[model samples]
Target: MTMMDMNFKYCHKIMKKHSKSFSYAFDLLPEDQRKAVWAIYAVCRKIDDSIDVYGDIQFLNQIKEDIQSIEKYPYEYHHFQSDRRIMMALQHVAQHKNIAFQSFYNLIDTVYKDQHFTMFETDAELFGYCYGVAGTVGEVLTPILSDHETHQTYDVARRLGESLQLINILRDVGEDFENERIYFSKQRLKQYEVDIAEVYQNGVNNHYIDLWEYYAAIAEKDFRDVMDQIKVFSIEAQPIIELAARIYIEILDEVRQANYTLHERVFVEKRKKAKLFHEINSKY
Candidate 1:
């Protein structure tokens, strides 16, 4: 097989291994779009794993430098030989699809922020972090997903990603705490009178539950707005975005039904996923 083919094959393996939700939605795309999406997902997974798994600042810095160098010297990307398949696949898709590299840069900036971690002092701080890491994913996907790209379309895509990240923050509070990170803002926690240490000791209470529901409400509003305006995407891309947004929305629902419990991670059941897929397919 050709080098490009092998690169895509490696990217597909990463996508299939890391994100069942994205893999299921991406499978509905045509061949080229599916390849592009897989390549993009692989890059994201690599960036995330750099800090979350290894706590490797050097590796993360190398990725940021690679993107900068690749922009200036595309052909010389081979200089960084490690994880070459994922990087080459990213270059191929970015060039083929006319995707801007700025989004990747923005994502790396957020990853750097994650590396020098501290508590978010305000909602704006946390939201900005979400926009950097997650909203940049939307910006990258916008070109691949739609030819009718407008400022509004990109805004909607960014909002969708931020909303999804919000749900993730709610679902993984326990896990993130274990990793010595907190997505919830310290200002909000103070306002709600929820103590972080007491949370680990005594678990949920009225104040903690109130803080949890507060963020959930924000995510719910964002999802409603995205669902209302999803028509900005291409017809072919609409169902995929709808399916992803809906599944995350359902995750928000599951978290609510579980009473905002942070100890146990929440998941959408397979049966519920099948139902969500059928509903989206019928609508689109």
Candidate 2:
């Protein structure tokens, strides 16, 4: 097989393995765009894994080097999170679609900052970080989607990213606390009369539930606000974005149904996700 074919195969394999949810979204894109999205996913997965798995200063330095190398060579590396895949996938999209690399760089910077800052003192701070890491992806992806105008898409994408980030924070609360990483905004916790001490004493409590509910509500609102832009995307892209929002919102619903109990990890039921996907697909 040709090198391009081999790269496509490898990119597909990585996407299928690491992101089942995202793979569904990737499939909705035009063929070339789909491959490019996979490359982006693969690069992101590598960066994320390197941070979580390696967890050493030296290794992180190496990761920085790897990122720079991709910026430089763009085609010579192939290990997970290597510069090659990012360059190969992004260079085309960056030039053709005019994707803002600065947004992506902001994403990387935030992830690196995460290695240091484990807790957020205010909603503003948390949302700012969320925008940098997750919302930025939306900004990057918005241009590639067909049919939507850039300004509208940008606003919706930002909201979409923030909503997803909140979902992630809610889902991973226990795991994060165990690692001394707290994502709940301190100000929100305070508003509910909850503090880190209380969280540490009783990881799952009414205060926690209240705080979770507040964030969930905010996330839901953001998702809803994005619906207009979502509908404007082409038939192929619309359902995927729509379903993703639904699935994520459903997870929040499950959390609410559980009374925001932190002990039991909350997730979207697979059957429900499938149903949502089916319903969305039927619409188009």
Candidate 3:
């Protein structure tokens, strides 16, 4: 295989290892787009693990510098070698797709905030945080997935990404709390009279259910907004986008079926995900 093929193979491994849900849809992309998305996922996964798993701030900075310097000096990556296949593959795609490296930086900024920030003070801050991390994913992918870049295409992508992020926050509430992170804004909790102290002692209750549904409604609207505008993406990209959004929306359904008690992480079973995939495939 060529060196480029080797790089993409490594990236595909990372994508498959990390995200079963995404890998399902991504595996169906045209070979070139598949490799590009794998490369992008690999880089983002590295950035996420640096902050979420390892707390390696230095590595995060290193990635920032690596991508920034690569923006200026692409050939330097060959000299460094050093088994940095993930970023190397990312550089290849970023160059080819004209993907804005700034989106990666913006994503890293959000991960950096994860280290210091524990609570959202308002809905704006919560949504801003979503935009920084998840919306940036859409921004980066829009150029890759769309037939033509238009303002509406990007808008739908960002909205879809943010909605998925909200589902992540809701689904992972218990796990996140175990890690000492609370994603809900103070105002929303107060609006539902969700007493954090009580939650710490007894876990989520009726108030928490109200809070979950409130944000779930917002996420639902966001998903609907994207579905309404789904044609903004290329034919090749549309079904995958729809499948991913549908799968995540089903996660919200699972949580609701469980009555919003997030003591356990909610999941859409693999069998159901396959069903959703075929449903989307048939539609497209």
Candidate 4:
């Protein structure tokens, strides 16, 4: 196969392995951009895995340096782990689109900061992190399709990132609390008379569940608002954006179906995912 074909195949395999939600949405992307998105996801997974798998300060510091080198000399930094397919993929996107390296640096910075700070003191602070890591991705990717109307795209992308982050927080409450990392805003917990210590000790309760659902509802609203803005994109980009929004919106249902339980992880079934993928593909 040609080099581009090999890269496409590799990208497809990685996306299918890591993210069913994204893989389903990727079906709707234009072929070149689909491959690019996979590369971005791969890079993110690499960073996340580094943080999760290696707890050593020295190793993480090395990763920080590697990330910094990539940011400083986007074309010159090539020494990365063999498993860093995502970084490879990002390299392609960066060269092709001339994506700002600072966005990537900000992404790595947030990942590195997680080593020191596990919880957010306020919604604003958490939102800022989400913006840096996830919203920056939206900014990076939207330009790939040549749809760079800032007023229309930027706020929606930020909201989409915030919504996804909130979903992640709600879904992983059990694990986060177990790790002694509380992400729920302090004020919200105070308003509900729910102590973060109590949550860490006993997991989520009805009061906490209520608060979780409230914030989750706000995430849903953000998703809806973002979808509205996505519709304004060119026809070629709309289906891809719609697919992503739909898959993420399913998380809200998953949350509700679980009855706000934090004990077991919840996800859309494979069959449903396949159906969504097929439906999105059929739209093309």
Alpha-carbon local distance difference test for all models: 0.83, 0.70, 0.83, 0.70
Report per-prediction Cα RMSD to one decimal: 1.9, 3.3, 1.9, 3.2
* Stretches > 4 Å off in candidate 1: 52-55, 75-77
Which whole-number lDDT from 0 to 100 does residue 263 have in model 2?
62
Order of quality (lDDT): 1, 3, 2, 4
Clashing residue pairs in all predictions, respectively, total 0, 0, 0, 2
- In the range 1-42, model 3's lDDT, one tens digit per residue, is 998899899889988888877887778889989898998888
Indicate the worst ten consecutive residues by lDDT in candidate 2. Answer: 77-86
For model 2, state the Cα shift of residue 265 in Å: 3.6
Q: Give a tens-digit lDDT track for model 4, residues 1-284.
A: 67656665676787789887878776667777777777766666666666656564554555556655666667875776444444555666776765655666677777778778755667788778778768776665666644555656656665776677777777777777667677888767778888756765676678877888788788888887886676656678777777776777777788778766656678888688667657877866
lDDT of 1 at 186: 88
Model 3's TM-score against the true structure: 0.93
**TM-score, structure 4 vs. true:** 0.84
lDDT of 1 by residue, 1-284 (tens): 89899999989998878776777777778889889998889888888778655556777777767666667766554566336788888877766676768988888888877767889999999999999989999998998888778999899999999999998898888888887888889899999998766786686888988898899999999999988998898888888888888887888778778876667888887678778989988876
Candidate 4 accuracy as lDDT:
0.70
Residue 244 of model 4: what lDDT?
A: 74
List candidate 2 stretches off by more than 4 Å.
52-86, 147-149, 196-203
lDDT of 2 at 62: 54
